Design a protein around this ligand. Structure first.
Ligand SMILES: Nc1ccn([C@@H]2O[C@H](COP(=O)(O)OP(=O)(O)OP(=O)(O)O)[C@@H](O)[C@H]2O)c(=O)n1
Ligand SMILES: Nc1ccn([C@@H]2O[C@H](COP(=O)(O)OP(=O)(O)OP(=O)(O)O)[C@@H](O)[C@H]2O)c(=O)n1
Ligand SMILES: Nc1ccn([C@@H]2O[C@H](COP(=O)(O)OP(=O)(O)OP(=O)(O)O)[C@@H](O)[C@H]2O)c(=O)n1
Ligand SMILES: Nc1ccn([C@@H]2O[C@H](COP(=O)(O)OP(=O)(O)OP(=O)(O)O)[C@@H](O)[C@H]2O)c(=O)n1
Ligand SMILES: Nc1ccn([C@@H]2O[C@H](COP(=O)(O)OP(=O)(O)OP(=O)(O)O)[C@@H](O)[C@H]2O)c(=O)n1
Ligand SMILES: Nc1ccn([C@@H]2O[C@H](COP(=O)(O)OP(=O)(O)OP(=O)(O)O)[C@@H](O)[C@H]2O)c(=O)n1
Ligand SMILES: [Mg+2]
Ligand SMILES: [Mg+2]
Ligand SMILES: [Mg+2]
Ligand SMILES: [Mg+2]
Ligand SMILES: [Mg+2]
Ligand SMILES: [Mg+2]
Lengths: 557, 557, 557
């Protein structure tokens, strides 16, 4: 199997992840079955512990893995569905070697970082690179491996030593190394400095790997004097020194790498089945990036979120809105609202932030209430959902935003105002949203509804069924314990909020639609994880169609 | 003696030289006698070989050393006059140890980089730190040493090993280490990255030195989260992590370091005689930097130069004009003209550049023709000198610009039009400028007029004598072989170009003034090397006084 | 051209020089024209400054270079005659780049360690590798380069960086890298430790070279568990991990390397013209090493030397006696006498050392008085020469030992007892040995008789003429200012000391033989520099023939 290791030299933030994704998109576009692995040298075994303000969003895989948001980037840029073990961590690798030691699988030998942790990294890479990750059943051809942190980090030492050994298990004509490095320039001279690239490549050779491409991250395109000096210290030819300068879009990074001629180099170096050709599918990526720079018409939506600021807490929710806005030829404007700042309570302590949040909500062409857990921000979310319903604004509720949209319709439209959740107010007089965990043979106690599940349409009279292509059912990704109470469903059948999607066991109601409204829907699944740049996730496409006013024209095709 | 070594971590362009100068200015302002050394790890033994487009200007010392332009920065920021051996080079140190080996001073032992090159660096530092460099006869108190290149460079290895040994010859309470490092930030996240500082400080500890301050070069002020993380890896307290972010002026860098509290730290660390005090002379520097940001009135001068572009070819010529413009409360505008682009010949091949050069010359409030050597640009210089004379524009000619201003007055005002130089057209029919080298006992052949020489005024009727404070003579720095022909001086005495300055031997005429003009003067010395920020060099002060029109009012005080 | 760089990893004393010599002997034995270069990273430009107690002997080349004794090892192990520039030094390379800077050959650019010192090392290697060094006129095929010091030394940094660049100027199929490393073992466990090899190979990869063989220096042969672990960290195959454990003879090291199969590897790696073959000339080396272990009969000689102990002061004098003793099938016993300990004066201060020196001299089968300079030890040398003459012992006097053997025959056999030298007692009443330097056009003043000179036989009645193959003249290497006085030659013609060799100018007498003695000869040249393991230098062969008593039987063949 062919392997591309992507490493970082100078500083951790240089974009190793967009390079590795774009390399993957390129090789996918050449007609190769591409898999991808990420090494996160952190001790967390999975993402499920993360508070989304720190580190970012938790991404959910088809298999029910809770994984880093960076593996969602590989799922967007390559048409693939990763398994949880395409994320390798220091926590996973050390936990696996510890468990083998406790069982005595190491035959009473001393278990050591070299060879035994380093052998575990190589066994795990060869095993997961062989797992099919496209729709096709046949095994992959290239694995793109991204290694987190920078060369010379303590946390990365067991993985660079694993790849030092691995480039001899996989032959020369199979293993390949991309080093991503910072080429800084200062504002006074305006000279691009090769020195951190030199010192990080010296360190990478000491650690025992040698670059096959160098990719320079720089604030403007590198000159030939930089390409030749990097070539003089780093043992690469000047055509094997690339730059990815900072640009308009991540959709442009694959297109810059094809201009910098990386396909020719991988055909030579990895002996790839590509052939010489005048075309590959990157013309569809080139169109999408040239569309993205031409987006002039604004479409502006309010995201009523559980957190004080966006770093990455809604990173794929944002990307699903962008795919949908690109597909609808509008520039997305994401008006983020820290949900607590809508609460009537806060005007007694910070009225400037309270009026600011409501002005931003009143601008909206559509409202998105995304998923989450806990009491925090729920009251502010409820005020925005009820604004969306009363002021006739297009609406998508995801997971928690759907549970709150069942709750507020019972409170405000059935006058069942003692109705509440069970995660918040667990003693509720009429518990309309309830704890209802998944339970199976071979598992201890109740567990989350987590990963891909079939959700079946109840009726042909659904806007989501139309947006999903008039199909009988959908498979979509879930991450929750809680559900609408199945016994309290009767109180809805007289009135405007319908349920339109249901679990295959019948036990759970999973999609709602409010009648007599432009578009108002809630889903229990997270449709953003299934979203792709070339083809938006239908609930977000419907929300942005409805936001500009195109939905009633889209349903005619 | 107290010693401050200043080193660079990540990349060479971070401003080690303005840090080391400003540390020096600070300690000078506290009342200490400060000397300064620079290590240039290049193999050039002196600057005299440099073509000024590459590397920059050649600076001339009082002793006749041809030295790097960076030692001119230490002469400007500290009121000192360096000797040639305050510049240490790899060429100097290796040449000195080779010469001792040839003589057998090393007693037939193998001469080795360690100890013998490293002992030569320490002998040279202790010897030159003891040389008085102020007007005062008493020995210095602090030496500021700047080391060129970055940590981990091959060229810097013999000097970091010398300072590793040296910090035990000079005790702990005498030796101190400033590490200047890049803290980059990327445009997307806007996060200041400590990682290159970490890796360069690890390398500096391996090489055997440990920082006592860290100075961060960054595009904006470093946050406390950066100060604390650098402190966590680098073994400095968070108050010992400074930044010098990019700013309006080099005159502000000393003032930023006093705000960042370095004086308190050097009093503690080096046990300095400063005492605790509410004041030190940096209030005069603080005034000058707050003046420099308030310069609104433009004063615009044409510099008719021998080179295709300014990197640093006229670096102290520019600084002498800036000191003069600050002292006259005007913003200098330096209209640089590549002199060849004034030649009537070039319009036959690039007329766009020809008209562009003459438009820039026609804007001028004053003209400066600086020194140089060779045929190149002389014809274009002559056209600008004759423009300056005919169109009544204020004028300073330095070295070559003075020789050309004697030549063109013979050509165009005495009608001696066969008159020419000897460096250019060495066969001249009437050689008005001639080769006339200095000759002495204990020297082989003729040699340059090089370093400080007494030039004596011929008359009280001189504008330069008035600008020099009505003094009988001046001492100023020279760098030339050539002179006006002493036998052809008779042809001038009837007409408007006077000679007003002469050598003490009488053999050489060294200052000219043209009558019936606002200000038109030429000097054989380079007055810019003697110029200081607090007190401009009189010929440049006169040129910028005359440029705005203030000279006739300045002569009244 | 093919190039073999030999480098040292862990400690400097591991035998890089015997590895590089033996690689050279191997490739010479395969039929290749082999040249050799040594890098000495010391600042001495030549060996002429060395006091032979420190560093060792000064070796003299055919061209008159005074060079390191290590280049004499390459002259012994390969049948070659090196030029002075096959020794590269830090002194030579820095002196050459400094001289080019002073002349302006670098076009007014800043001259830097990278590229300009590193380019000087590569220019010098390509230039000297092309110089023919065998008797054949055709250019070499392989250059063996030995680099002194160890990886990570400051002194070696400009040369490892030169070879890092050089392995891309010379292609992969031309440049090759041997890393010699210590594999220690401790007395308690008896385990061979690969760790210093690992860490020095990591450092060598950082510096930018990667091993192609590893040669382990170890106290016993390395096991396969060591070969496989070194292969696992160092990126060599286990057949490319050699050892040279400590052994009986340097003549065995080539023979151990052919057992460890290096010829096969160089044919593969350097595409060498060798062909596959069942034989190469190393069977003659294998014979000589199996002879050397069978030497049982002692032949014991007194060397009356100018120094307090042998480190290497007589290193090639010793090797010329060993070649001669091997050729005569005797084990040499070298009774070294610190010459001062024979002086009658020393019995007044250390009589134990005085009687010890005379007991060792009285054991002698032959006496060797080697060359030198100065007053020191001359009186003790004279007492041993006069012992050799009076007690009928075989005798060789080299350079100073020849001058003293003319002096003592005038003093004790002509009764000219006021006769003395001019280097010692320069005021002599009858100066029998005189300062007589070589003088030529294109040189300033008088200079040493230095390098190869033709010495012509005066008579057929010479034992040295017989030992030299009855040839009319010899070419041999000289290193002195002093000579026998040509005017005082008349005093000898009546008596037993003949002169038998003379310069081609006639001006100098260069060989003496004493009649009525088994063998007593002196030469002005140093015959040991011309000596080779397969064919001894005739004056030393004659001395060891005469010592056992074989000379009168050798003259019969
Ligand atoms: N395949 C990818 C990769 C990155 N991004 C975007 O780029 C950002 C992260 O950039 P990345 O390439 O991961 O580099 P950094 O995270 O900045 O740093 P690192 O080198 O550690 O990845 C994310 O906000 C994400 O929106 C993306 O959309 N698709
Ligand atoms: N291993 C190396 C590489 C270069 N240098 C030195 O680096 C200096 C140039 O400094 P700088 O411009 O900082 O290095 P560059 O190689 O030009 O890299 P950059 O592109 O970052 O400037 C030269 O004098 C050269 O002797 C060194 O000492 N050791
Ligand atoms: N005492 C000083 C130091 C610097 N400068 C200005 O700053 C520039 C050079 O900055 P410096 O501090 O020398 O840093 P760099 O030269 O950029 O890089 P290095 O760290 O190698 O010095 C020069 O153009 C000079 O005009 C100055 O005016 N006075
Ligand atoms: N010697 C060190 C120091 C830090 N880390 C790792 O560095 C990672 C953080 O990466 P990055 O942000 O790139 O490093 P910072 O220390 O935050 O430095 P910067 O300010 O440049 O981000 C952590 O996971 C930590 O395990 C490491 O492996 N080895
Ligand atoms: N071609 C050679 C090489 C070495 N020797 C012998 O080996 C000793 C020196 O060993 P060498 O191989 O030069 O290694 P060292 O000098 O011990 O250390 P280095 O690795 O620095 O050479 C000398 O005394 C010399 O007699 C020899 O006879 N012939
Ligand atoms: N880059 C490396 C290589 C090895 N080890 C560790 O080295 C230990 C073995 O120690 P030691 O025997 O000293 O190393 P060896 O590799 O066996 O080398 P040697 O032949 O010198 O023993 C193992 O636990 C392994 O984790 C390490 O931490 N880092
Ligand atoms: Mg990432
Ligand atoms: Mg540079
Ligand atoms: Mg500088
Ligand atoms: Mg960080
Ligand atoms: Mg040696
Ligand atoms: Mg071990």
């Amino acid at each position: 199997m062919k392997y591309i290791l992507v490493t970082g030299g100078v500083i951790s933030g240089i974009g190793k992840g967009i390079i590795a994704s774009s390399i993957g998109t390129i090789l996918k576009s050449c007609g190769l079955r591409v898999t991808a692995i990420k090494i996160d040298p952190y001790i967390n075994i999975d993402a499920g512990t993360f508070s989304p303000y720190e580190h970012g969003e938790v991404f959910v895989l088809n298999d029910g893995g809770e994984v880093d948001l960076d593996l969602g980037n590989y799922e967007r840029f390559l048409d693939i569905n990763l398994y949880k073990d395409n994320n390798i961590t220091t926590g996973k690798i050390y936990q696996h070697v510890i468990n083998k030691e406790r069982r005595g699988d190491y035959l009473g030998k001393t278990v050591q970082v070299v060879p035994h942790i380093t052998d575990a990294v190589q066994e795990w890479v060869m095993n997961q690179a062989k797992v099919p990750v496209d729709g096709n059943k046949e095994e992959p051809q290239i694995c793109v491996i991204e290694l987190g942190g920078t060369i010379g980090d303590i946390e990365g030492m067991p993985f660079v030593e694993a790849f030092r050994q691995f480039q001899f298990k996989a032959k020369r004509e199979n293993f390949c190394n991309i080093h991503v490095s910072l080429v800084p320039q200062l504002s006074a001279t305006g000279e691009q400095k090769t020195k951190p690239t030199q010192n990080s490549v010296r360190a990478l050779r000491g650690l025992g790997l040698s670059p096959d491409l160098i990719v320079c991250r720089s604030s403007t395109p590198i000159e030939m004097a930089v390409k030749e000096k990097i070539s003089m210290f780093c043992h690469v030819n000047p055509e094997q020194v690339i730059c990815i300068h900072d640009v308009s879009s991540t959709y442009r990074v694959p297109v810059l790498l094809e201009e910098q001629s990386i396909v020719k180099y991988f055909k030579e170096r990895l002996h790839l089945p590509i052939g010489d050709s005048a075309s590959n599918l990157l013309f569809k990526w080139r169109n999408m990036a040239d569309r993205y720079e031409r987006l002039q018409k604004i479409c502006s939506i309010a995201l009523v979120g559980k957190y004080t600021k966006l770093r990455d807490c809604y990173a794929s929710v944002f990307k699903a809105l962008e795919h949908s806005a690109l597909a609808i030829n509008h520039k997305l404007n994401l008006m983020y609202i820290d949900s607590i700042d809508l609460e009537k309570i806060t005007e007694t302590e910070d009225p400037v932030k309270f009026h600011e949040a409501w002005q931003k909500l009143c601008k909206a062409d559509g409202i998105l209430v995304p998923g989450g857990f806990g009491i925090r921000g729920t009251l502010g979310k409820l005020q925005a959902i009820s604004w969306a319903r009363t002021k006739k604004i297009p609406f998508l509720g995801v997971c928690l935003g759907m549970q709150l949209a069942v709750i507020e319709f019972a409170r405000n439209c059935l006058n069942l105002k003692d109705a509440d959740s069970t995660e918040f107010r667990p003693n509720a007089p009429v518990p309309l949203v309830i704890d209802m965990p998944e339970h199976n043979p071979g598992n201890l106690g109740g567990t989350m509804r987590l990963g891909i599940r079939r959700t079946v349409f109840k009726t042909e009279n659904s806007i989501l069924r139309k947006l999903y292509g008039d199909v009988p059912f959908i498979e979509e990704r879930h991450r929750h314990r809680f559900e609408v109470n199945p016994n309290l469903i009767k109180q809805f059948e007289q009135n405007d909020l319908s349920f339109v999607g249901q679990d295959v066991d019948g036990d759970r109601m999973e999609i709602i639609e409010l009648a007599n409204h432009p578009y108002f829907v809630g889903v229990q699944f997270h449709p953003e994880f299934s979203s792709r740049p070339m083809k938006p996730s239908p609930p977000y496409l419907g929300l942005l169609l409805a936001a500009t006013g195109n939905l009633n024209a889209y349903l005619q095709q």
